[PDB]
Amino acid sequence: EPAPEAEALAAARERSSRFLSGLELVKQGAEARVFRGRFQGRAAVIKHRFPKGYRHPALEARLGRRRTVQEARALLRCRRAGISAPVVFFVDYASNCLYMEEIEGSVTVRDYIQSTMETEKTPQGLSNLAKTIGQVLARMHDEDLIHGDLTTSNMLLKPPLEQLNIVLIDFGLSFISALPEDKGVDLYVLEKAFLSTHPNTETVFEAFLKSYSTSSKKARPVLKKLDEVRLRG
Amino acid sequence: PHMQLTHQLDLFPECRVTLLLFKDVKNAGDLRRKAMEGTIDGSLINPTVIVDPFQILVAANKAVHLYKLGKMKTRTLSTEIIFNLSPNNNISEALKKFGISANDTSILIVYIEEGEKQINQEYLISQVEGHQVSLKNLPEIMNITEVKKIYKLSSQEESIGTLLDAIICRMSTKDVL
Ligand SMILES: Nc1cccc2c1C(=O)N([C@@H]1CCC(=O)NC1=O)C2=O
């Protein structure tokens, strides 16, 4: 006979897959899918990693648990530190699904930069955006939170768009570290995203670094590590 | 045609959560004893520290989830709802600060119905020596100073969202610290 605990766990995973079955996809990562839905009257997104087909089921569960736990922990750390990021509503560890606030009507920094560059043909008007991102990531690193996946796709602009209300998302690869090297690698991923996704925006990244250095008292050794990790590619 | 507030659980569509709010309660001590004896249905919750029904529905969703998995932190569904409201994992502290005591005069009753489990609401209301009110009256019963006290809500948390949102973040993530 099957164990009642295992039967109960299977029923919960069925509930979760059923809830997700009819929902609209809003984001597709490498491992993760993000769907939009409703949670007890609030606009919500639900984040889950589906088995890929070629891996052991136990390995997939371990992966989903690790990244779901890391993201829930990071989002709590963000909120308590006044770093703007989605509210966590509920974390389902039976299925490794994360229910959090939908940042309604927002655009990614990636899309905002590309639209600005295609309308204005100049990055001069992105200086305020760069300064804001510098202030936000300085606060995150000063809380020793390493994002782990810092691209312009993981920063949202909450409307009204021109207020530059930056909201950080997708902390599944995040971790806690005070080491300048880890903070330096974080900034390096972001530099590469600017360079390969937003060509001819070097002034934008330069203004980001200027604002980051102004905003964090610990930026000097981080920027030295950023230079080193670029070389030791 | 009544003052109750009810919501289905989105993730457990066969469950309905009901909220009943009472003021001028005169038998809170009897009510607390009856809950311990299992002769009154529901979680008896201190509304002075409840900011919004969403706070209750989040706590109820988690309680039902762990009830069905058999992985609750506390003994019963009614204690689990109350425990889930607390920002930390001390069970005795949670049940005392978010539950009701003999010197409370306002009470919120929360219960969950599903399947064969039906609550006699008229009988329940008859057990409270107090005046039922609509949940619209919760803002005059909730005490913002006590809420910030219980939750250690902080200035940086308030700079980026509501008190409710910071509360929800604490509640939803406390199980992984
Ligand atoms: N990956 C996360 C993680 C958390 C929150 C969100 C996302 C996410 O993609 N969105 C989009 C932004 C655009 C929008 O209008 N609605 C959404 O659902 C989110 O709010």
Domain coordinates in residue numbering, chain B? 5-176
Distance CA A79, CA A56 (A): 35
Write out the H or E segment, with its range, that includes residue B19. Answer: strand B15-23
**Which residue of chain B is at minimal alpha-carbon distance from A69?**
B176
- Written as six digits, the tokens of A64 are 């989903």
A186: how many CB neighbours lie within 10 A of its CB?
25
Q: How far is CA B87 from the centre of its chain?
A: 13
Write out the H or E segment, with its range, that includes residue B131. Answer: strand B131-133
Q: Nearest Cα to A111, choosing from A152, A145, A140, A74?
A: A152
The C-alpha angle B61, B151, A215, rounded to 5 degrees, equals 110
Selected catalytic residue, list A149, A170, A182, A186: A149
Q: Nearest Cα to A89, choosing from A102, A106, A78?
A: A102
Contact (CB, 8 A) for B26 and B130 = yes
CATH class as words, domain A107-231: mainly alpha
* Placement of tokens 């530059």 in the chain: A164
Q: Which of A12, A80, A101 sits opposite B69 (nearest CB)?
A: A12
Chain B contact probe: residue of A69, A83, A90, A96 with most B CBs at under 10 A = A90
The residue count for chain A: 233
Phi, psi for A37 (deg, rounded to 5): -160, -165
Active-site residue flag, A111:
no
Q: Nearest Cα to B7, choosing from B19, B22, B20?
A: B19
Homologous superfamily (CATH) for B5-176: CGI121/TPRKB (3.30.2380.10)
Contact (CB, 8 A) for B177 and A69 = no
- To the question of whether residue A32 is assigned a binding role by annotation, the answer is yes
Q: Please tell me the residue having the least CA distance from ligand 1 atom 4.
A: A169
Residue contact B165–A94, C-beta within 8 A: no
**Chain A residues close to B173, C-beta within 8 Å:** 72-73, 75-76, 88, 91
Q: Is the dihedral of CA A157, A174, A196, A222 positive or negative?
A: positive
Q: Is the dihedral of CA A143, A146, A147, A151 positive or negative?
A: positive
Contact (CB, 8 A) for A201 and A194 = yes
Count interface pairs A-B at CB distance under 8 A. 88
Burial tier of A144 (Cβ tally within 10 Å: 0-12, 13-18, 19+): middle
Q: Nearest Cα to B169, choosing from A141, A167, A77, A166?
A: A77
A48: how many CB neighbours lie within 10 A of its CB?
21
State the method.
Answer: X-ray
A140: how many CB neighbours lie within 10 A of its CB?
25
**Which residue of chain B is at minimal alpha-carbon distance from A14?**
B11
To 10 degrees, what angle do helices A202-215 and A127-142 make? 40
Residue contact B169–A40, C-beta within 8 A: no
Q: Where are the alpha helices (DSSP H) in chain B?
A: 28-37, 53-69, 77-85, 91-98, 121-127, 138-141, 144-151, 155-158, 163-173
Distance CA A129, CA A162 (A): 9
Distances, alpha carbon B7 to alpha carbons A40, A226, B13, B57, B113, in Å: 8, 52, 10, 8, 11
**Chain B residues close to A12, C-beta within 8 Å:** 65, 68-69
Burial tier of B99 (Cβ tally within 10 Å: 0-12, 13-18, 19+): buried
To 10 degrees, what angle do helices A127-142 and A180-197 make? 150
- To the question of whether residue A49 is assigned a binding role by annotation, the answer is no
What's the gap in Å between B117 CA and the centre of ligand 1?
38
The C-alpha angle A165, A171, A174, rounded to 5 degrees, equals 125
